[PDB]
Every structure is written in C-alpha cells, then in structure tokens.
Tab-separated table of C-alpha atoms in Angstrom:
chain	number	residue	atom	x	y	z
A	16	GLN	CA	-0.024	0.006	-0.095
A	17	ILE	CA	1.076	3.479	-0.837
A	18	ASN	CA	0.458	6.709	1.157
A	19	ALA	CA	-1.415	9.732	0.212
A	20	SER	CA	-1.863	13.551	1.235
A	21	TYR	CA	-4.712	15.846	0.803
A	22	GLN	CA	-5.025	19.720	0.552
A	23	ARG	CA	-7.927	22.211	1.316
A	24	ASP	CA	-8.288	25.795	1.023
A	25	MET	CA	-9.530	28.166	3.674
A	26	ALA	CA	-12.379	30.556	2.864
A	27	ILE	CA	-11.773	34.165	2.163
A	28	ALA	CA	-14.255	36.210	4.380
A	29	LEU	CA	-17.532	36.190	6.252
A	30	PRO	CA	-20.349	38.535	6.455
A	31	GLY	CA	-19.753	42.081	8.093
A	32	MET	CA	-15.948	41.580	7.994
A	33	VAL	CA	-13.423	44.405	7.343
A	34	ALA	CA	-11.833	43.499	4.101
A	35	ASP	CA	-8.417	45.190	4.599
A	36	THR	CA	-6.425	47.561	6.497
A	37	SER	CA	-6.930	50.796	4.315
A	38	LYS	CA	-8.056	53.978	5.807
A	39	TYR	CA	-11.405	53.183	7.589
A	40	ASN	CA	-13.589	54.674	10.275
A	41	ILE	CA	-15.867	53.049	12.865
A	42	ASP	CA	-18.577	54.793	15.010
A	43	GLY	CA	-19.335	53.261	18.326
A	44	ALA	CA	-21.503	55.974	20.040
A	45	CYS	CA	-24.571	54.539	18.249
A	46	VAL	CA	-27.505	52.529	19.667
A	47	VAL	CA	-29.895	50.146	18.197
A	48	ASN	CA	-33.440	51.235	18.387
A	49	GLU	CA	-36.914	49.182	18.023
A	50	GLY	CA	-35.452	45.915	16.654
A	51	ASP	CA	-32.216	44.172	15.901
A	52	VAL	CA	-29.566	44.511	13.110
A	53	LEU	CA	-28.127	41.421	11.132
A	54	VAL	CA	-24.345	41.797	10.931
A	55	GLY	CA	-23.298	42.793	7.461
A	56	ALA	CA	-26.300	44.819	6.634
A	57	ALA	CA	-26.838	48.613	6.107
A	58	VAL	CA	-28.388	50.681	8.926
A	59	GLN	CA	-29.958	54.188	9.117
A	60	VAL	CA	-30.136	56.988	11.551
A	61	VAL	CA	-33.563	57.823	13.000
A	62	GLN	CA	-32.583	60.558	15.442
A	63	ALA	CA	-29.417	62.111	16.875
A	64	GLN	CA	-29.553	63.394	20.342
A	65	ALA	CA	-28.634	67.031	20.627
A	66	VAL	CA	-26.865	67.443	23.941
A	67	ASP	CA	-26.430	63.660	25.110
A	68	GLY	CA	-24.499	62.712	21.960
A	69	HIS	CA	-25.852	59.165	21.027
A	70	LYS	CA	-27.280	58.349	17.617
A	71	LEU	CA	-30.268	56.060	17.214
A	72	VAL	CA	-29.771	53.551	14.306
A	73	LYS	CA	-32.213	50.813	12.965
A	74	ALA	CA	-32.495	48.478	10.110
A	75	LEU	CA	-32.844	50.133	6.764
A	76	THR	CA	-36.494	50.638	5.412
A	77	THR	CA	-38.058	51.659	2.143
A	78	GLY	CA	-37.736	55.498	1.232
A	79	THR	CA	-34.616	56.162	3.605
A	80	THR	CA	-30.819	56.815	3.253
A	81	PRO	CA	-28.343	54.285	4.545
A	82	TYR	CA	-25.488	55.561	6.896
A	83	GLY	CA	-23.194	52.508	7.721
A	84	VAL	CA	-22.618	48.783	7.671
A	85	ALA	CA	-22.479	46.718	11.050
A	86	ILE	CA	-19.415	44.806	11.423
A	87	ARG	CA	-18.131	41.909	13.336
A	88	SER	CA	-17.232	41.706	17.042
A	89	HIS	CA	-16.941	38.806	19.400
A	90	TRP	CA	-17.782	40.722	22.440
A	91	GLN	CA	-20.512	43.176	21.683
A	92	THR	CA	-22.919	40.859	19.790
A	93	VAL	CA	-25.414	38.037	20.630
A	94	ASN	CA	-25.939	34.637	18.812
A	95	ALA	CA	-29.476	34.242	17.539
A	96	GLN	CA	-31.128	32.244	14.710
A	97	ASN	CA	-27.691	30.697	14.023
A	98	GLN	CA	-26.084	34.083	13.181
A	99	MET	CA	-24.525	37.040	14.949
A	100	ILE	CA	-26.704	40.042	15.602
A	101	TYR	CA	-26.982	43.327	17.765
A	102	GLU	CA	-29.769	43.155	20.116
A	103	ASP	CA	-32.162	46.252	21.046
A	104	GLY	CA	-30.907	48.980	23.433
A	105	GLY	CA	-27.091	48.246	23.049
A	106	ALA	CA	-24.078	49.733	21.570
A	107	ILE	CA	-23.314	49.032	17.978
A	108	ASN	CA	-20.189	49.305	15.583
A	109	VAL	CA	-21.151	51.149	12.356
A	110	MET	CA	-18.407	51.378	9.841
A	111	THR	CA	-18.900	54.722	8.052
A	112	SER	CA	-15.837	54.509	5.561
A	113	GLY	CA	-13.552	51.754	4.181
A	114	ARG	CA	-13.802	48.384	2.535
A	115	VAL	CA	-16.146	45.675	4.025
A	116	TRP	CA	-17.721	42.436	3.109
A	117	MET	CA	-21.609	42.322	3.201
A	118	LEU	CA	-24.319	40.060	2.106
A	119	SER	CA	-25.679	40.014	-1.312
A	120	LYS	CA	-29.058	39.039	-3.159
A	121	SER	CA	-27.635	39.119	-6.631
A	122	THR	CA	-26.464	36.382	-9.015
A	123	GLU	CA	-23.779	37.732	-11.206
A	124	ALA	CA	-20.251	39.437	-10.603
A	125	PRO	CA	-20.601	43.223	-10.489
A	126	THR	CA	-18.464	45.638	-12.546
A	127	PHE	CA	-15.531	47.377	-10.634
A	128	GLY	CA	-15.942	50.876	-9.554
A	129	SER	CA	-19.775	51.201	-10.282
A	130	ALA	CA	-22.576	52.431	-8.002
A	131	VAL	CA	-23.957	50.049	-5.276
A	132	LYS	CA	-27.651	48.963	-5.466
A	133	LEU	CA	-29.452	48.241	-2.363
A	134	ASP	CA	-32.553	46.260	-1.517
A	135	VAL	CA	-35.431	47.283	0.803
A	136	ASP	CA	-34.274	45.276	3.807
A	137	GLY	CA	-30.658	46.583	3.758
A	138	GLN	CA	-28.874	43.762	1.809
A	139	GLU	CA	-26.910	44.227	-1.586
A	140	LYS	CA	-28.872	43.466	-4.665
A	141	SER	CA	-28.681	44.452	-8.511
A	142	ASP	CA	-31.632	46.441	-9.884
A	143	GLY	CA	-32.839	47.654	-6.500
A	144	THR	CA	-34.667	50.765	-5.617
A	145	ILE	CA	-32.712	52.418	-2.793
A	146	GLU	CA	-29.839	54.810	-4.012
A	147	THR	CA	-26.300	54.859	-2.653
A	148	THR	CA	-22.962	56.493	-3.326
A	149	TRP	CA	-20.722	53.587	-2.369
A	150	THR	CA	-18.612	51.463	-4.939
A	151	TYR	CA	-17.765	47.821	-5.543
A	152	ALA	CA	-14.170	47.030	-4.449
A	153	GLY	CA	-13.859	43.906	-6.818
A	154	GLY	CA	-14.806	41.079	-4.359
A	155	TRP	CA	-17.228	38.215	-5.261
A	156	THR	CA	-17.032	34.999	-3.302
A	157	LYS	CA	-19.417	32.601	-1.368
A	158	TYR	CA	-18.962	31.059	1.934
A	159	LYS	CA	-20.928	27.688	2.171
A	160	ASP	CA	-24.200	29.133	0.210
A	161	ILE	CA	-23.857	32.523	1.592
A	162	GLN	CA	-23.084	35.386	-1.161
A	163	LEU	CA	-20.937	38.037	-0.292
A	164	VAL	CA	-19.608	41.270	-1.977
A	165	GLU	CA	-16.835	43.826	-1.177
A	166	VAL	CA	-17.967	47.243	-0.857
A	167	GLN	CA	-16.029	50.621	-0.549
A	168	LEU	CA	-18.005	53.028	1.815
A	169	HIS	CA	-17.695	56.833	1.651
A	170	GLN	CA	-18.644	58.927	4.680
A	171	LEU	CA	-21.816	60.862	4.509
B	18	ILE	CA	-35.239	10.074	16.987
B	19	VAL	CA	-33.474	9.529	13.736
B	20	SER	CA	-32.158	5.904	13.049
B	21	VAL	CA	-28.667	5.183	11.553
B	22	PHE	CA	-30.057	4.131	8.138
B	23	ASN	CA	-32.092	7.289	7.657
B	24	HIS	CA	-29.631	9.927	8.828
B	25	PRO	CA	-29.486	12.820	6.316
B	26	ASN	CA	-25.682	13.472	6.348
B	27	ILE	CA	-24.194	10.102	5.833
B	28	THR	CA	-22.878	8.706	2.294
B	29	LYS	CA	-25.314	6.217	0.742
B	30	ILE	CA	-24.080	4.056	-2.277
B	31	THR	CA	-26.285	2.483	-4.724
B	32	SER	CA	-25.073	-0.978	-5.644
B	33	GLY	CA	-25.722	-3.865	-8.210
B	34	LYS	CA	-27.125	-7.008	-6.630
B	35	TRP	CA	-24.374	-9.322	-5.469
B	36	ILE	CA	-26.858	-12.245	-5.919
B	37	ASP	CA	-29.089	-12.128	-8.925
B	38	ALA	CA	-31.322	-15.333	-9.055
B	39	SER	CA	-28.790	-17.691	-7.534
B	40	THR	CA	-25.752	-16.319	-9.671
B	41	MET	CA	-22.965	-15.235	-7.408
B	42	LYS	CA	-20.955	-12.085	-8.421
B	43	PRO	CA	-17.739	-12.296	-6.193
B	44	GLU	CA	-16.025	-9.422	-7.963
B	45	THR	CA	-18.728	-6.775	-7.572
B	46	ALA	CA	-18.718	-7.153	-3.867
B	47	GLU	CA	-15.015	-6.541	-3.562
B	48	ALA	CA	-15.011	-3.608	-5.935
B	49	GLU	CA	-17.835	-1.929	-3.989
B	50	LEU	CA	-16.194	-2.581	-0.644
B	51	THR	CA	-12.837	-1.035	-1.981
B	52	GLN	CA	-14.921	1.937	-3.160
B	53	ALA	CA	-16.623	2.493	-0.045
B	54	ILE	CA	-13.233	2.214	1.978
B	55	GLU	CA	-11.629	4.838	-0.447
B	56	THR	CA	-14.694	6.933	-0.194
B	57	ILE	CA	-14.303	7.168	3.562
B	58	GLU	CA	-10.474	7.851	3.080
B	59	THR	CA	-11.086	10.660	0.709
B	60	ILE	CA	-14.062	12.379	2.245
B	61	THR	CA	-12.392	13.237	5.504
B	62	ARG	CA	-9.001	14.166	3.857
B	63	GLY	CA	-6.976	11.413	5.536
B	64	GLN	CA	-8.041	12.007	9.083
B	65	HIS	CA	-10.211	8.798	9.354
B	66	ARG	CA	-9.682	5.197	7.943
B	67	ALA	CA	-12.308	2.530	7.618
B	68	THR	CA	-12.024	-0.220	10.268
B	69	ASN	CA	-15.263	-2.226	10.588
B	70	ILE	CA	-17.763	-3.733	7.971
B	71	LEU	CA	-21.008	-5.414	8.626
B	72	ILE	CA	-22.567	-7.573	6.162
B	73	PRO	CA	-25.862	-9.648	6.058
B	74	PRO	CA	-25.426	-13.247	7.332
B	75	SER	CA	-26.712	-14.779	3.924
B	76	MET	CA	-23.994	-13.268	2.012
B	77	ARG	CA	-20.975	-14.970	3.600
B	78	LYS	CA	-21.234	-17.575	0.840
B	79	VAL	CA	-20.205	-14.979	-1.734
B	80	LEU	CA	-16.916	-14.321	0.150
B	81	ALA	CA	-16.103	-17.957	0.557
B	82	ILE	CA	-15.633	-18.626	-3.295
B	83	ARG	CA	-12.279	-19.776	-4.447
B	84	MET	CA	-10.850	-17.305	-6.918
B	85	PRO	CA	-10.379	-19.082	-10.312
B	86	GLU	CA	-7.094	-20.877	-11.170
B	87	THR	CA	-5.776	-20.749	-7.547
B	88	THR	CA	-6.539	-21.720	-4.031
B	89	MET	CA	-6.974	-18.814	-1.618
B	90	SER	CA	-10.459	-17.122	-1.580
B	91	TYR	CA	-11.821	-13.531	-2.300
B	92	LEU	CA	-12.087	-12.738	1.460
B	93	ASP	CA	-8.519	-13.877	1.964
B	94	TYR	CA	-7.181	-11.813	-0.803
B	95	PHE	CA	-9.198	-8.668	0.540
B	96	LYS	CA	-7.733	-9.191	3.898
B	97	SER	CA	-4.273	-9.654	2.522
B	98	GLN	CA	-4.672	-6.231	0.572
B	99	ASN	CA	-6.251	-4.465	3.478
B	100	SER	CA	-4.813	-5.886	6.780
B	101	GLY	CA	-6.031	-4.086	9.655
B	102	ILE	CA	-9.883	-4.276	9.211
B	103	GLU	CA	-12.677	-6.479	10.967
B	104	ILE	CA	-15.638	-7.974	9.049
B	105	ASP	CA	-18.667	-9.214	10.885
B	106	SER	CA	-22.332	-10.174	10.266
B	107	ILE	CA	-25.452	-8.659	11.679
B	108	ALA	CA	-29.047	-10.027	11.242
B	109	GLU	CA	-30.421	-6.368	11.364
B	110	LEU	CA	-29.107	-5.844	8.009
B	111	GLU	CA	-31.119	-8.585	6.301
B	112	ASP	CA	-34.109	-5.958	6.114
B	113	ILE	CA	-33.629	-2.236	6.269
B	114	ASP	CA	-36.812	-0.810	5.165
B	115	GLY	CA	-39.475	-3.426	5.951
B	116	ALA	CA	-39.691	-4.636	2.333
B	117	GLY	CA	-36.583	-6.966	1.910
B	118	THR	CA	-34.071	-4.425	1.065
B	119	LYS	CA	-30.599	-5.450	2.163
B	120	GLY	CA	-27.397	-3.302	2.841
B	121	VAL	CA	-23.854	-3.232	3.885
B	122	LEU	CA	-22.354	-0.913	6.535
B	123	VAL	CA	-18.604	0.291	6.610
C	24	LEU	CA	3.549	10.838	-8.048
C	25	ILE	CA	0.021	9.737	-8.830
C	26	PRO	CA	-3.370	11.132	-7.901
C	27	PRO	CA	-5.180	9.242	-5.048
C	28	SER	CA	-8.130	8.139	-7.074
C	29	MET	CA	-5.815	5.854	-9.261
C	30	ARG	CA	-4.439	3.989	-6.202
C	31	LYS	CA	-7.038	1.071	-6.764
C	32	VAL	CA	-5.915	0.452	-10.386
C	33	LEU	CA	-2.357	-0.648	-9.150
C	34	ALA	CA	-3.915	-2.982	-6.533
C	35	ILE	CA	-5.646	-5.393	-8.962
C	36	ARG	CA	-4.284	-9.019	-8.940
C	37	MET	CA	-2.967	-10.389	-12.118
C	38	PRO	CA	-4.789	-13.320	-13.602
C	39	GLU	CA	-3.678	-16.862	-12.517
C	40	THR	CA	-1.671	-15.225	-9.457
C	41	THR	CA	-2.284	-13.932	-6.043
C	42	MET	CA	-0.248	-10.643	-6.114
C	43	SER	CA	-0.942	-7.245	-7.326
C	44	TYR	CA	0.473	-5.287	-10.140
C	45	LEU	CA	2.342	-2.904	-7.731
C	46	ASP	CA	4.243	-5.711	-5.987
C	47	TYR	CA	5.579	-7.043	-9.331
C	48	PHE	CA	6.339	-3.657	-10.596
C	49	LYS	CA	8.178	-2.761	-7.301
C	50	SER	CA	10.154	-6.071	-7.615
C	51	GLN	CA	11.235	-5.293	-11.152
C	52	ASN	CA	12.121	-1.576	-10.386
C	53	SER	CA	13.946	-1.497	-7.151
C	54	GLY	CA	14.851	1.825	-5.628
C	55	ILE	CA	11.798	3.901	-6.985
C	56	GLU	CA	9.259	5.309	-4.664
C	57	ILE	CA	5.701	5.698	-5.705
C	58	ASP	CA	3.474	8.116	-3.725
C	59	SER	CA	0.055	9.928	-4.084
C	60	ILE	CA	-0.430	13.750	-4.189
C	61	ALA	CA	-3.960	15.098	-4.222
C	62	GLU	CA	-2.956	18.227	-6.123
C	63	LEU	CA	-2.657	15.791	-9.185
C	64	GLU	CA	-6.290	15.449	-9.486
C	65	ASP	CA	-7.014	18.647	-11.435
C	66	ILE	CA	-3.898	19.980	-13.409
C	67	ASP	CA	-5.714	22.513	-15.579
C	68	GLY	CA	-8.932	23.347	-13.881
C	69	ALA	CA	-11.234	21.049	-15.856
C	70	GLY	CA	-10.674	17.786	-14.064
C	71	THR	CA	-7.878	16.381	-16.122
C	72	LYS	CA	-5.457	14.207	-14.133
C	73	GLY	CA	-1.779	13.745	-14.457
C	74	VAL	CA	1.249	11.536	-13.179
C	75	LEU	CA	4.656	13.186	-12.560
C	76	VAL	CA	7.978	11.027	-12.850
D	22	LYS	CA	2.513	69.316	-20.190
D	23	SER	CA	1.176	72.654	-19.393
D	24	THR	CA	2.996	76.012	-19.498
D	25	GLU	CA	0.595	78.175	-17.251
D	26	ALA	CA	0.121	77.831	-13.573
D	27	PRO	CA	-3.182	76.310	-12.516
D	28	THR	CA	-6.106	77.853	-10.357
D	29	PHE	CA	-6.173	76.497	-6.793
D	30	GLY	CA	-9.223	74.171	-6.135
D	31	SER	CA	-10.093	73.703	-9.987
D	32	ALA	CA	-10.493	70.216	-11.366
D	33	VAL	CA	-7.675	68.546	-13.200
D	34	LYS	CA	-7.779	67.094	-16.832
D	35	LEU	CA	-5.478	64.478	-18.063
D	36	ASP	CA	-3.797	63.578	-21.474
D	37	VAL	CA	-4.042	60.450	-23.697
D	38	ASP	CA	-0.641	59.563	-22.477
D	39	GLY	CA	-1.448	59.831	-18.893
D	40	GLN	CA	0.076	63.198	-17.887
D	41	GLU	CA	-1.416	66.422	-16.898
D	42	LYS	CA	-2.613	68.937	-19.402
D	43	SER	CA	-4.477	72.192	-19.280
D	44	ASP	CA	-6.988	71.180	-22.067
D	45	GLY	CA	-7.367	67.387	-22.008
D	46	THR	CA	-10.062	64.920	-23.157
D	47	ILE	CA	-10.183	62.858	-19.892
D	48	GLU	CA	-12.325	64.188	-17.116
D	49	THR	CA	-11.216	63.644	-13.635
D	50	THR	CA	-12.468	64.344	-10.076
D	51	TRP	CA	-8.933	65.081	-8.794
D	52	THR	CA	-7.914	68.668	-7.696
D	53	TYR	CA	-4.930	71.035	-8.014
D	54	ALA	CA	-3.041	71.795	-4.698
D	55	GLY	CA	-1.280	74.930	-5.872
D	56	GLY	CA	2.380	73.886	-6.341
D	57	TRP	CA	3.874	74.608	-9.641
D	58	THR	CA	7.715	73.723	-9.925
D	59	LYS	CA	10.039	72.628	-12.782
D	60	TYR	CA	13.200	70.564	-12.208
D	61	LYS	CA	15.721	70.740	-15.067
D	62	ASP	CA	13.292	70.826	-18.001
D	63	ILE	CA	10.743	68.683	-16.391
D	64	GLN	CA	7.347	70.260	-15.464
D	65	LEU	CA	5.753	69.185	-12.272
D	66	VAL	CA	2.420	69.966	-10.701
D	67	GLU	CA	0.967	68.995	-7.206
D	68	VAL	CA	-2.375	67.150	-7.338
D	69	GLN	CA	-4.732	66.130	-4.634
D	70	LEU	CA	-6.130	62.711	-5.264
D	71	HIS	CA	-9.664	61.712	-3.942
D	72	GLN	CA	-10.777	58.075	-3.258
D	73	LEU	CA	-12.811	56.386	-6.243
C-alpha cells in the first residue's frame, strides 16, 4: 500500500468583515432602536440626540438613506437564529468609511467601480430601488451558500 | 429520533445486486467494498480510515468462493490487501426498510 | 507521483496469481518510490489528471 | 505638459498619454493643490487625489 496526502483551501471572508487595513472609520456611540440588526447589513439613523451625543440607528427601510454597515465583534454581539446580531438597546459598531464584506442577493459578478444598488431590507442586490453612493471593490465569493460582496464605503 | 439508516448526512451508495437469481458475483462485492473504503478515506481528507464492515449473514457464501485458477479465496485476498480491518455479520441488515431491502455498513 | 483516485488501479491482482501489479512492478524496479499527491487530480482546472515522474 | 500655473481648487484634466494637460479629453475628479515647480526641463504639478 502507498500513502497519500490531501489539501484544502480556507475560505476568504465572512459577513460583516473588514476587508483590508486601508483607511477606515468606525462609530461606536450609536445605539440600536426598536429591533435588531443583522451583522453585515446597512443601517439608518432615525434621530441624533442634541446634547447627550448618542445616535439612534435601526435596520434600513424603504424610502430612507443608509448610513453605515454593522461589522463583526465577538464581544458586543449575541448569537441568535444561528447568526450574529446586535440586540435592541445596546451599543453597536457602524463602519462609515472603508472596505467591508456584506451580504448580497445578486447572481452575477458586478463591474468594478460602479454604484452600489441596495434592497429594501438593507442587503446588496442589483436592480434595486434604494440609491447609494458607495462603490464595488472587486470582491465576489461565496461562503457555503452565503453570497458576499466587497463594498467601498464613503462617509456621508 | 433518527435511525442510523435514515440519517440525512451520511453517504449512501447504490449497488448492483451481489446475488441475481442464484448467480454469485464475487468481484462486484470486492469492488464496491474497496470503493466504500476509499470514499471514507477521501471524504475526511485522511483523518479517518475505515476499520469495520457489517454484512448480511446470508452473503457470507459470496466471500467464500475460491478465486479461479488458484487456492485462496476472495475474502483472503481482500484481507491480505487490507490488513487491519474487521468484518462481521449482523442480522439487522437482512431488511432495512421492511420490504426486503438489504445493505452493507462500513 | 500519482493522484489518489488511481491507487486502486495498481492493486488489482494479475490473472492466475495472487499478487497485485504494484508488487511485481516494485520487484522489477528496485529503488523507486511511488506516492500519491491530491494536487494531481486537477492539473488545468477542468478535471484532467496527471502523473509526474 | 502645460505652461501656465493652475488655479487652486479647480478640477484637473489628463492627457491620452497619462500626464497632466491644461486642455485634455479625460475628465477627472482630482484637484490642483497649488504647487507649480520645474526641475531641469521637467514640468511638475501638485495634485490632490480623491478616493474612487
């Protein structure tokens, strides 16, 4: 009998993961309001406190403007429906500029540098309705039946 | 409660019948057993090797046939090429779905 | 170096005898090592296999 | 490849070769920063680059 050796490749990235170490910016003085946010999905600001300083964020809804994308953290997140989320009434990480991996609803690779199309529920999808000023950073991979995309985020 | 034959994450292999109307096929059994062992070897990327086989008690006659133009049998050749494995018989394998379906477990 | 999926081809016994092809080949060719490398399954990205000597 | 100093804050236009030109056919969102210097018959200009 003769021996054998095998080889396997690690996956690239995961939802709500900072893509690389370029210039970025994260806001942590924001608090979740009336619901919960999936990690890797866009959020929106409903009200900013005038004197207290905190900002109220919630999951994106139709006829609104996105502000940032929630990112991964092993300390400030909870495990629910087999995923990682931010619960109501707690501090949240919102990345406002830089490269990040986020969930997608599309089926084909996007063109480098074009505008980002958003879906009503806060996930990336072509031919969507919500208008954005972010760009694609040229990343298109799938982690075990979950479709991800690399997005470059500009500060509002 | 999920049985061991109905588990939805195990590997099932369809097989040609070893006995077709009292016509023994002693090479198909060896080929399929080797295929199953190699499948276990290549699905865990070398971290697990097959060690136990369970076969129906009525199929022990197929593995006792002398190979043509020699003395030692198919089972002896299989053991010589795959030393380190244990083969046994279980009566629970005579029927696996209530309608006479047989099977082998590796 | 051969792909792992072709290890079973070299284990077939020759007719009228009780030893495999690999044993006779190794007896004839002393001093040559045969091994398996899973990187040889796909050599061009379409499933074509290959053997390296 | 120009000969006149640029106006601070105005958008920059490039040439087909890939160098700066006062009247080029490629539109770009970068900016002039004000510097205008020449080093031994080579014309240089300071440009502010914005992320795509």
